[PDB]
Design a protein around this ligand. Sequence first.
Ligand code: SAH
Ligand code: SAH
Ligand code: ZN
Lengths: 262, 262, 59, 55
Amino acid sequence: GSLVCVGTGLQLAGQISVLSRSYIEHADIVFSLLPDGFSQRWLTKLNPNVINLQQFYAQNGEVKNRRDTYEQMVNAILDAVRAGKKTVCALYGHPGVFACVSHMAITRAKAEGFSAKMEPGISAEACLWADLGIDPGNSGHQSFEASQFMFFNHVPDPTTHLLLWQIAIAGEHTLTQFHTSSDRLQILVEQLNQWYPLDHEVVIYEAANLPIQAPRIERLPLANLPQAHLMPISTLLIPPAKKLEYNYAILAKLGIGPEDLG
Amino acid sequence: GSLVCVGTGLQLAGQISVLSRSYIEHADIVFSLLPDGFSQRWLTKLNPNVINLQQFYAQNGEVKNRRDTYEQMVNAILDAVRAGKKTVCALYGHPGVFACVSHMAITRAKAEGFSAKMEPGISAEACLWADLGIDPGNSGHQSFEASQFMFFNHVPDPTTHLLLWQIAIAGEHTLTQFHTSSDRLQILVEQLNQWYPLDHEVVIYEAANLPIQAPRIERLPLANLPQAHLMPISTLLIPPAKKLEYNYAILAKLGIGPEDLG
Amino acid sequence: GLSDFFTQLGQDAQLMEDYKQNPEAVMRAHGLTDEQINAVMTGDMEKLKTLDVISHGNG
Amino acid sequence: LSDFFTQLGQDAQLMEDYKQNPEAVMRAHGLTDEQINAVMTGDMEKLKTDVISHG
Ligand SMILES: Nc1ncnc2c1ncn2[C@@H]1O[C@H](CSCC[C@H](N)C(=O)O)[C@@H](O)[C@H]1O
Ligand SMILES: Nc1ncnc2c1ncn2[C@@H]1O[C@H](CSCC[C@H](N)C(=O)O)[C@@H](O)[C@H]1O
Ligand SMILES: [Zn+2]
């Protein structure tokens, strides 16, 4: 038995790798975590032996730590591997970006002597750059999980494009809820205010999951965030707020200046 | 005429999205910029009408600003669009990730009243996460272009994974040379030393372009960087210098403490 | 019917470019009802279906 | 040679078959000894005989 984790991207059907699609096709069994039922139909057609990992999420409003959900997912995957099945894990987007299930399964698989690898895919971040015509290189890029940004010590660079993933549960410390409160979001605003003014335009981005669907690109002042309608798939883009200051110190050691910059 | 810039990914043939391949196949004309001749061949068998942009790069020990190189690229791409041809730009990886041509061509296109879009691809970044088995959401992620980090003022968060792209030309201001020097990279080591000890293990990464090729994942102390063999496709990874520490300030506002984290 | 179309449209760049030119025409020709087309044109993903967090930051 | 790589990179059945036995699969596709030797020594140049960001 072996393990290959792949991504299906965001968009239905067309945004998966050619190779990644082939992996699903030839798999003995597929463990899926997909955005919707259209994506789940497409997969089943591609390979009928599919187990939907979605089931391991809290059901009927029960209190359940997501850590436990993930552990169960990982274990279900390994169960198939151990049994001797050429197993494929298909996650939406990139399987190893802001997703721990694939990294944990692979890690455990290797330690048990099974072949395991990860095939890169197209993520929400990849979609963002394209949808808002931004090149992350222009002024650099930064990503954090929204809650971690609040719970731990992170200092952003205000000259770069900043992203806060899982903004919908920003400050939800229990990991048993699906969303956070406006109060939490307000604390975030006040925290962000260390670097970004209140009227600083930010963007609520949501990549489309269907071909007939347009992406959500909602611009608003930072202060309005707490009142905004957020979804589990929402990502927060905080565009630069500051001018690039010349590292005169380094240019000097380079023996050059701005005027010499090609 | 119309424009669609797609990405081919980093791996030959198989790391392009299904939709993106179909665009190449149905294009009137294709402008390519691929890592090698193996993919160039594959491309030509997908669609024989291809103009290889590589020609616009400096040729024959010629001093040319990469800027003037990109200008011509964009111009050529546009020429086909303005002629009425269903045009496609097939770039390696993600078409808009540290890729100026595409964004410049989509902008010029739309402004002249043509239909232009960007389809996301698998970037070198996406490959790195899967090869190294690192999730960017673990302790966060930052990406800067090496030279820009040395030229302007960028403050990295030493708890995150830090990437410096185009490290091979780090400090190369003229934008005419194909690589930098030892003393340039030495000044980067001293710069980075503000945050990272000299013996901090960093990783020179190179995503494979061929299916029979393993990636370059070379670990070494930050100090030995100026003696390292770097290629135009080399990205520098700098793992966290520090572990995540609690943000008691905000935890207090949330009216919680570490022990309360789920 | 509805699912089959979306699957194809997502994969087939020809059809996609056909849909961009004339969404209603392409949709009507693929058997989509008025309600389905209406939902698409108003972006009511909710109805269309009728007719995602895999990590955390608690260390 | 270029034909084998294209297949291998697209076909996951062929990929997994290669990773079981690289030599056998390569020999079955008519690669020469120096070609196979070049693969196992990870010499991409012999097998074969990008910057678009500024500022
Ligand atoms: N369609 C979408 N548009 C924008 N952001 C999205 C998204 N789907 C997921 N996300 C982001 O990703 C988080 C879920 S984690 C899953 C990420 C996915 N593997 C990827 O590669 O993108 C969400 O909370 C949000 O921050
Ligand atoms: N195969 C590869 N492995 C690692 N880094 C790579 C790479 N190809 C390109 N890069 C990075 O990208 C820089 C060129 S910019 C082009 C990047 C490309 N659009 C992408 O999708 O990644 C290089 O200097 C290097 O930092
Ligand atoms: Zn990133």
